[PDB]
Amino acid sequence: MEARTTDLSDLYPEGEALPMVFKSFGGRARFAGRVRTLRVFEDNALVRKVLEEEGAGQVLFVDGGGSLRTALLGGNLARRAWEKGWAGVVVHGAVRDTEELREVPIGLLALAATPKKSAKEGKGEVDVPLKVLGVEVLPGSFLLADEDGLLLLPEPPSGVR
Amino acid sequence: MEARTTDLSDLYPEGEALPMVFKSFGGRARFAGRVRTLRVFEDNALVRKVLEEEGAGQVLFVDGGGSLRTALLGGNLARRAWEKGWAGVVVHGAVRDTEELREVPIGLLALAATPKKSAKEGKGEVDVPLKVLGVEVLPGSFLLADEDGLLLLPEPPSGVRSGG
Amino acid sequence: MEARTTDLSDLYPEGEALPMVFKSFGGRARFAGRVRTLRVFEDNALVRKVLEEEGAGQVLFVDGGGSLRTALLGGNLARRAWEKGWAGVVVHGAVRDTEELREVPIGLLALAATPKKSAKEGKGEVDVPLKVLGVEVLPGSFLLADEDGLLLLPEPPSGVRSGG
Ligand SMILES: [Cl-]
Ligand SMILES: [Cl-]
Ligand SMILES: [Mg+2]
Structure with a gap:
């Protein structure tokens, strides 16, 4: 996964990739793990609930409908995720506490930072x-992320044998 | 920090907020003040006239229709705004002389820089x-600006705790 | 760079200009050169064929239609262009190997990075x-690029072409 x-992507042409239209707010720019999806819209109740669960090196992919009106994640929730073992959080929407997010050593991607809290x-x-x-x-699916964007694979990369 | x-935004749910989708071109990443507005389109004679008025504790919000064709503010106006005391300028549109804007100790947000001057x-x-x-x-209204975006309050923070 | x-833009009002809406991926954000154009859609065979020619201080302008699905340029080709003397590449679309790109000392502007290589x-x-x-x-045309954007002229400024 490194x-x-x-x-x-070159090895897995069928693997689906996403461009880096997201800003890397977290301490880690490169991260990867089994994905777990979540779809919401200007309400992060489920975001908090899910991240309180055990991370186990997974990556939370949040789809906030690409809305920049409210933040689906902040510093407090970012730190929780980290303490819960998540490899990273990807947000198709907004987040906040830019200064606090950068301190958490995990992957944190979002379209933009926005003031208001979500419902x-x-x-x-x-x-x-x-x-x-x-x-x-x-x-x-297994999500892979770095400076060039994101890659969703049906199985973690190998090489062992 | 302050x-x-x-x-x-938490203390004032009635406030309006804008995401940080503007690039920071000024020497101040954080600034705030009483809002002063202006609507123009690829023309900034009004920008020069207004920034010449005393702007102590104020923020000028320039609505350029979002155009990136011409700059509504350059190095000269940035310096003028500063000499007149403006706390900052927010441009829904473009600016120019980015290298010069960065050196002025005022807040300066815009969607992008562009080469052509405005009419x-x-x-x-x-x-x-x-x-x-x-x-x-x-x-x-009162405007607040930082790395997390822009907060617009009907008036500055009312001391209902000890200040905000 | 000059x-x-x-x-x-002030000197040549008639010239065409584009706002800096591109991300600067190369090791130089300032560059200039005679323009070579290319319009492609998520395919980079022609981009490679073109940059494989003598660069001679030219700038390649690739119009990938703005797509961010596939990268029209990678590290190997970027370094190749550089060794061929190309002054820079402007891509209205995406690129990849951003880490490698930052190490190539020519202009390399694009809307974004993306993982998938092009057809x-x-x-x-x-x-x-x-x-x-x-x-x-x-x-x-002669193209000039810097932090304030892109300017297209019919001929190099009153300097000495090639780089400004
Ligand atoms: Cl000016
Ligand atoms: Cl440079
Ligand atoms: Mg009152």
Whole structure:
């Protein structure tokens, strides 16, 4: 999982990639892990719930509908995720506490930073197929991320034998 | 560190907010002040006239229709705004002389830098309600700007705790 | 690297200019050169064929239609262009190997990085007028690029062409 997205894409042409239109807010720019999808819209109740779970080196892919109106994740939630073992969080939307996010040694990608907090109701769906920028994000897939963007693979890269 | 867009957003749910989708070109990443508005399109004679007015504790929000064709503010106006005391300028549009803007100790946000200068016929409106990226910006509101974005309050923070 | 896009824009009002909406991936954000154009869609065989020629202080302007699905340029080709003397490559589309690109001392502007390499079927148009962000880019023109944006002139400034 330490190969580059560019090199692995070359080996796995069928693997779906996403351009780096996200800003790297976290301490780690390169990260990877089994994906877990979440779809919401200006409400992060489910985001907090899911990250409180055990990370186990997985990557949370949040699809906030690309909205920049509210932040789906902040410093507090970022630190929790890190203490829970998550490799990283990818947000198709906004986040906040830019200064605090940079301190957390995990992957944190988002379209932009935005002031307001999201609502805390709980609308949204977990572990469901996603569609971000014309690409399918499927539960159980392995996400790879670096400076050149993201790569979703059906199985972690190998090389052992 | 001091006031923040985020904290104050929590304390003031009625405030309007804009994501940090502007590039920071000024010497100050963080600034705030009483809002002064302006609407123009590829013409900045009004920008020069208004920034010449005393801007102590104020923030000029320039709605350029989002155009990136011409610059509404260059090195000269940036320095002028500073000499006149402006706390900052927010441009929904473009600016130029980025190397010079960076050296002026005022806040300066814009969508992008561009080479061409703006016309100077003087078309535009002063201190009128603006609608930027879905958010209404009003002359007389208080603006806060930092790395997390822009917060617009109907008036500055009211001491209902000890200050904010 | 020399003459500023802002100063020359003032001097040559008729010239065409583009805002700095590109990310500077190369080791030099300032560069200039005679323009060579190319319009392709997620295919980079022609881009490779072109940059494999003597660069001689020219700038290649690739119009990938703005797509960010595949990279029109990688590290090997970027370094190749550099060794061929190309002054820089402007890509209205995406590139990859950003880590390697930062190490290539020529202009390398693009909208974004993306993992997928492009197809190599070789389709596209070489040295034809281009239409990037409402501005026309003509092959033969002289391009200047810096932090303030891109300026296209009919001939190099009153300097000595090649680099400004
Ligand atoms: Cl100016
Ligand atoms: Cl440079
Ligand atoms: Mg009151």
